[PDB]
Design a protein around this ligand. Structure first.
Ligand SMILES: C[C@@H]1O[C@@H](O[C@@H]2[C@@H](O)[C@H](O)O[C@H](CO)[C@H]2O)[C@H](O)[C@H](O)[C@H]1O[C@@H]1O[C@H](CO)[C@@H](O[C@@H]2OC(C(=O)O)=C[C@H](O)[C@H]2O)[C@H](O)[C@H]1O
Length: 377
């Protein structure tokens, strides 16, 4: 059912850890090999997250040892503040530092994650009323810009608050999430990728993207970040509207799933085989669907509908996109897309797609929920 699928991921990760050594996988680029970086992108945490996931599934120290080393790398990355002037602090540290604390209660890890939360919390522009996504403070173009991806960076702040009792975190967390819900989600339940606000007064300027097909289109990964993001924020904040928004976006997504069960990179481009896909968006949604259901009561007949939608998605990814552990392939699922608009890895492995695909599996097979919040929140 789910064991075989997890088995391939397990074997692939085992080979990868040895081959990658201390480096981090990002995306493939025209082949079955991952392009590695020295912990300098926004995705390094997904590697740490996959290693932690494999460790919890097998108990095999080879995975933990690898994950532990990535934690040391993140400590050094924070120390020399390298490529951290971004909102992705959550993506980077929730699945690495925070994960280790969620996994084994490592105090050193905990503090590393809290330290990361601090630097991120400062990304909040009291005026704009939002956590600046990309660029430096007051950038001449991105000072007041929010990307839907940012919702996944909030759990690190929400977690820090509960661990520090400091109300700062939660306040800024909810402010950004409500702000996103109001300006990133559209009236037909679709969503904008990013939204711009005046840095000075904070007024709403417009919604748009440089990644989705058009400013008014629906980039599937963006819709996915919203589905999982809003659901995650609904858990921490006990916010029913955020949960409703998650459900709305989920139904919008599901109604546009193609015949083979995996989505194209954008809902507004030609929905046919010649268009590029984004298996990572389907993977993210599977997790998001399960997160949503977990917040619903059994009497709610929609709960099982989302659980089944999730199962169907994962099975679809497995059957038509998953790689077998053939001793060479380095990715879990094929046909993810980084930047179709730009021709950058438009049909490749994406480390985030792999992580969510694996998180969905461990959630479905073991009930493991990733590292966005303390197990059992
Ligand atoms: C400079 C960054 O890396 C570039 O590398 C590209 C490489 O991945 C590809 O395989 O080959 C290309 C040609 O050699 C090579 O240029 C990418 O082009 C990348 O776009 C570029 O900037 C990064 O872009 C991402 C996405 O816009 C930024 O934001 C992240 O995006 C996403 C997402 O879902 O795609 C999630 C995160 O929340 C968000 O931060 C990165 O910040 C930026 O570095």
């Amino acid at each position: 059912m789910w064991q075989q699928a997890i088995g391939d991921a397990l074997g692939i990760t085992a080979r990868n850890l040895k081959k990658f050594g201390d480096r981090f996988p990002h995306v493939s680029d025209g082949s079955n090999k991952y392009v590695l970086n020295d912990n300098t992108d926004w995705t390094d945490g997904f590697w740490s997250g996959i290693l932690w996931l494999c460790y919890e599934y097998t108990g095999d120290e080879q995975y933990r040892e690898g994950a532990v080393r990535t934690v040391a790398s993140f400590r050094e990355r924070l120390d020399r503040f390298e490529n951290l002037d971004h909102h992705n602090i959550g993506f980077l540290y929730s699945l690495s530092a925070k994960a280790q604390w969620i996994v084994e209660k490592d105090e050193s890890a905990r503090k590393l994650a809290l330290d990361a939360a601090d630097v991120l919390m400062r990304r909040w522009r009291a005026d704009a009323g939002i956590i600046q996504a990309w660029g430096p403070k007051g950038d001449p173009e991105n000072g007041g810009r929010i990307i839907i991806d940012c919702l996944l960076n909030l759990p690190l702040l929400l977690w820090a608050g509960e661990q520090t009792g400091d109300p700062e975190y939660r306040r800024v967390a909810e402010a950004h999430a409500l702000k996103s819900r109001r300006f990133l989600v559209r009236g037909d339940d679709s969503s904008y990728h990013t939204f711009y606000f005046d840095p000075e007064n904070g007024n709403a300027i417009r919604g748009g993207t440089h990644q989705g097909n058009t400013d008014g289109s629906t980039w599937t990964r963006g819709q996915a970040w919203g589905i999982y993001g809003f659901a995650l924020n609904s858990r921490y904040l006990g916010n029913a509207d955020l949960l409703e928004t998650a459900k709305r976006m989920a139904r919008h997504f599901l109604a546009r799933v193609p015949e083979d069960g995996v989505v194209y990179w954008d809902f507004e481009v030609p929905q046919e085989p010649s268009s590029y896909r984004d298996s990572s968006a389907s993977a993210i949604t599977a997790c998001g669907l399960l997160e949503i259901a977990s917040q619903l009561d059994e009497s709610d007949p929609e709960r099982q509908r989302f659980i089944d939608a999730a199962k169907t998605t994962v099975t679809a990814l497995r059957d038509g996109y998953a790689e077998r552990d053939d001793g060479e392939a380095e990715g879990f699922i094929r046909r993810g897309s980084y930047h179709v608009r730009g021709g950058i890895s438009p049909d490749d492995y994406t480390i985030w797609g792999d992580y969510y695909y694996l998180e969905a599996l461990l959630r479905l097979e073991r009930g493991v929920t990733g590292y966005w919040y303390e197990r059992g929140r």
